[PDB]
Design a protein around this ligand. Sequence first.
Ligand code: FEC
Ligand code: FEC
Ligand code: FEC
Ligand code: FEC
Ligand code: FEC
Lengths: 230, 228, 230, 231, 230
Amino acid sequence: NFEELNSMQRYSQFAVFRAIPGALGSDRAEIVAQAQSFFDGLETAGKVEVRGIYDLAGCRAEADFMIWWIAEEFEEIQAAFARFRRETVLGQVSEVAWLGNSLHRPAEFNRSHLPSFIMGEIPGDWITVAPFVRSYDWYIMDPQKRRKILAEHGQAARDFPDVRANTVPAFALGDYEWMLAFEAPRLDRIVDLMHKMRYTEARLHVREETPFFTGRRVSEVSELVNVLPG
Amino acid sequence: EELNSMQRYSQFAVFRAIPGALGSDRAEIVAQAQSFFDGLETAGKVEVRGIYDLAGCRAEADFMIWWIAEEFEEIQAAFARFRRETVLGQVSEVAWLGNSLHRPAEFNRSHLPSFIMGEIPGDWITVAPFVRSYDWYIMDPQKRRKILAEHGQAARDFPDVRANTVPAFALGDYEWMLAFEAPRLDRIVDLMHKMRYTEARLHVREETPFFTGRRVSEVSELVNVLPG
Amino acid sequence: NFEELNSMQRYSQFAVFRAIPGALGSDRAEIVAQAQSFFDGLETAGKVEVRGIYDLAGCRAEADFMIWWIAEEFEEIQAAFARFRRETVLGQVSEVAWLGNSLHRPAEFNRSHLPSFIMGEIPGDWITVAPFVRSYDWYIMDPQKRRKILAEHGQAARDFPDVRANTVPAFALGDYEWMLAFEAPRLDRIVDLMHKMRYTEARLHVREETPFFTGRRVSEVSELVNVLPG
Amino acid sequence: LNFEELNSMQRYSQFAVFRAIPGALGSDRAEIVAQAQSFFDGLETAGKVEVRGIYDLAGCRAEADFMIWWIAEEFEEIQAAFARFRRETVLGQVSEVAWLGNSLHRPAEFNRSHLPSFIMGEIPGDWITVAPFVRSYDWYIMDPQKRRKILAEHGQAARDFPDVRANTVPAFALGDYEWMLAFEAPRLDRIVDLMHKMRYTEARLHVREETPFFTGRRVSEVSELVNVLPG
Amino acid sequence: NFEELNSMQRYSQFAVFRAIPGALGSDRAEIVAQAQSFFDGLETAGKVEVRGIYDLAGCRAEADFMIWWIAEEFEEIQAAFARFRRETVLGQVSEVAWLGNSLHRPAEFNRSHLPSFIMGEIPGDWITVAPFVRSYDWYIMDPQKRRKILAEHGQAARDFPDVRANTVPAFALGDYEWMLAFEAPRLDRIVDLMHKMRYTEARLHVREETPFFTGRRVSEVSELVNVLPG
Ligand code: FEC
Ligand code: FEC
Ligand code: FEC
Ligand code: FEC
Ligand code: FEC
């Protein structure tokens, strides 16, 4: 029944940043120590949980890295986000590219469908994040019809148990209806999942699903900072 | 009634912080900004419903001023004065302006904006424009009336979310300005989710950008969070 | 007479400008005097008619003011636009934001429908200008159905005789089919006109109608120059 | 004319639209004019790239100030002249690329006497409007007899505008569009009126995109343009 | 059949860059030599295969050149992409304009249809690259209908065996569904192929297909660097 897990309050934010060429320089040791200190402090304060930091190099123009963090209260994410930008050189030398905000809620029909991060699953080595906006008719549609469509949609993913879904309401937290995050040990599994999921009636009820942000989880800030353009 | 006939223009003036412009020495900037707002209050022409920290809501937006006046020129003067004579306005950029003009509802004359009713502003706010489908206003009137009544019924479980829907024709690119004010952000999220389950959603063309943020108590609160 | 007004050749341009923070400064008396002389000169030269200069402060991001000028030859506007930008402090410190160009022509079915500025009517204290693009099927539609639609469109505006219309062809003069300008003594009259005109069948034949620019006609240049950001 | 030779010849066409960088030109422009004029002299001398005209787009739209229309047998020759203009002239160094409209002349599908004014070797018009074009998805798979009829009525709608010379040119894979369009006339109002009239055609039911438009006046020499540009 | 060529794992990236005016200057010989040694190094490491470097001069605003490279693992592309931007002057004076990422997979119906780069075919002297997004209904269409539509699509290109196609899944690797590249000895044949391919029923099942990037494969880096704006 997952009643407790369906009832908890957790805001989730994908903070996507772009490197400013020429800003970081080549002596990045102090910049890495400071950034690491900032994340250390977040962990100990216990309010904002960093699920991952991601190297988005080569995914798209105008984005380079992403922080996925989660908190019981959105003002806690606000504070940390603002703190990153204001009180760390890394945040001072990066530009905000895109923010994907969401608030976990129970599914309408399948109460066993819960985000990977809510289930406490270890995060995947590879991720793709994107927003979603359903067709205008999607929610006023007869409920048994929508139920059947979502049942097919889930069935279409049967061969990809290794790809972990995170489908989270984003209404009023930006321009979208949902935040999506797919975690997997291998990028090719996410590509193949997305390709297979095109073969679903649910595709007839879609309005927007970009931008996509795809990248590799790093073990520590030093691994990301060293990759960035100077 | 007298409220349905009241004249108030309302403006959501959304601003973006220019990285590197504010610096780390903001004491004088705060005091000057507070004097601007204090001066507005005692002149008594423009009412500031709230100033809002939008940090983390979206790229390219950082804070919002919601102010109201009887005449649009009064808002024009305050907006220009803020950009012209306060450092905070000089080192900020205008991201988006949401303008509206209070008018009665086409059917429900009791439906009145929270700011017209003088209600205390909410800790959390979501602001956005709205554009109906092309066919919406030439629809049969009782059909539209019924659709809007069911729309409102779907919000019954959210009496703590206060709504403001105000005409915005010719005051920019939109038909309506919306503001929802609540004591907790999650109430606003859940209201929008629930309100998707309505026939009115078959008659929508545009509803973005959204701006969501926390009301602050004084300008110092906001200035001290900005990126700098 | 009416034939003379329908056959007149008049180009019209809405030149919308954006202030550049930091360029104008705080000592503006000479800036004002110089701009007043430029427009005074325009008046006396007798080629370009300045119908108004409008404070757009607060209408939209990225615009601050607008010049509405008219001439028999588009080259006369090009010269006045180029001379404004090149030879006045005000034009040097402004960016061009949008240009709305149009060429007066007779209406298709009602040759008594003429732009306010062609009638020679005094300009209104408040204005809204915007482009317009009709649906693809509008002009090839049965002429009698389009005629009836426009007749009803006109009737829906009956309650707003104090709001003066200007509807002018804009084909090939930018990205639009028509330029619109609505002039009124109070802004609320324009807002309520636009709202009422939604209740017309012509709304089913629209493709584009943004950006809108709305503001206050100044009595002299000083009113505008003194409000702009420094 | 030799319609067969005109239809089979290979010519690429590029509308290169530029915007002046504010504050970049300055008030001392003679050296820039002499250098730019020397550049166009060189192109004419080499005989590869043909400049049909340089156009002053003042007052047409924000973010565009002038346009070069040049034509060559080989696209690489346009690439070379375009790059050399930007790289080796101050004019090109202090301007920004706003928009590029590339095309390759081909015979028309039904009326092989319909040829671009530039292929016919006609004097270029004093006024020009250029724009891309993208047809509806269904346009090409349509019954050919139906498409033919629609295009015949389209051409008929322009019967009163023989002074406006058309250039309709394929643009597939040379940018984001299906056609490049250029209409050349002795006065601007003729183009405005032609476009208005052409809305009254069935072809309008098979359109997807037709912007941005770039409209302006042909200059006689580089000096006339450089001296109008915003400082 | 082509079992091995169809099961092969290859990521492909089109990395489109734009020149930063004023950055390169007129001193370029050492920049060329450093870039050449960067690509020589990639070759010797044997992980990332550069299929071509392309001069896009004159194709479109805000793009100037493209790298087409291929690797078994996407992280190897990320590393080369990041190393190009970080450790070569050429990378540092260029801006990322657009990235076009794809992952080779077997065709749905015709497993003899394989990308030209997967077939080991020599790259073409001229290229056009673009993304693709099909209509929402494409993949749920009856399979035999879609098969028929694609067979007629392939038939329409029968006169163009000289233009070699690369159609590659792009799901989750950006905002698109497919990456397309068409390589030929002559540019005019690519234009003619695209024209002809409009005459197919598949065209009724299309949503997005831009931006296009078209240009000439260079024989060496110096041919590219010396044409770029200074
Ligand atoms: C990938 C992907 C997308 C984006 C691409 C597209 O939609 O085709 C995608 C799109 C969405 C979107 C919006 C929603 C939000 C609900 C809606 O009203 O749209 C959304 C929500 C749900 N998804 Fe979804 N998805 N999805 C999976 C992956 C993808 N999903 C995988 C895998 C599974 C299967 C495993 C799982 O349950 O964890 C799965 C199942 C569900 C269920 C549970 C249905 C059930 O089985 O009854 C719900 C609820
Ligand atoms: C949230 C939200 C939106 C945007 C999302 C959506 O469109 O689904 C939203 C959309 C709009 C838009 C445009 C209009 C403007 C009128 C029109 O023609 O569009 C608009 C206008 C009205 N709303 Fe609306 N809304 N709305 C609420 C919240 C939201 N509303 C809540 C709560 C209530 C419940 C009542 C109350 O609190 O006043 C409510 C009811 C009304 C009534 C009164 C109907 C009645 O009860 O008979 C009018 C008139
Ligand atoms: C406001 C407004 C818009 C934009 C909003 C919308 O389209 O709903 C608006 C849209 C357009 C557009 C395009 C055109 C161009 C013609 C076409 O083919 O679209 C356009 C053209 C016409 N309008 Fe229009 N309008 N419009 C008024 C206000 C607005 N109008 C008012 C007031 C009156 C009434 C007073 C007058 O004649 O001056 C009025 C009447 C006309 C007539 C004359 C009709 C007649 O036979 O009675 C013509 C022709
Ligand atoms: C202006 C204008 C446009 C853009 C606006 C619009 O689409 O309404 C415009 C749009 C297009 C477009 C795409 C094409 C490309 C073919 C396609 O399949 O769409 C395109 C192609 C053709 N046009 Fe077209 N036009 N067009 C003229 C002006 C405009 N035209 C004038 C003038 C004439 C008449 C004189 C001339 O032939 O030179 C004329 C006729 C033709 C013929 C020859 C028809 C014949 O059989 O009679 C062909 C082929
Ligand atoms: C050009 C061009 C486009 C983009 C323009 C437009 O779509 O009209 C174009 C679009 C696409 C797109 C997406 C796909 C991806 C699959 C899908 O579901 O969309 C896509 C996929 C395929 N194409 Fe395609 N194309 N295409 C060729 C050229 C173009 N193609 C040429 C040449 C040949 C023929 C030679 C070859 O097999 O390599 C050819 C054939 C195929 C086959 C094999 C069909 C078969 O014969 O049964 C498949 C699979």
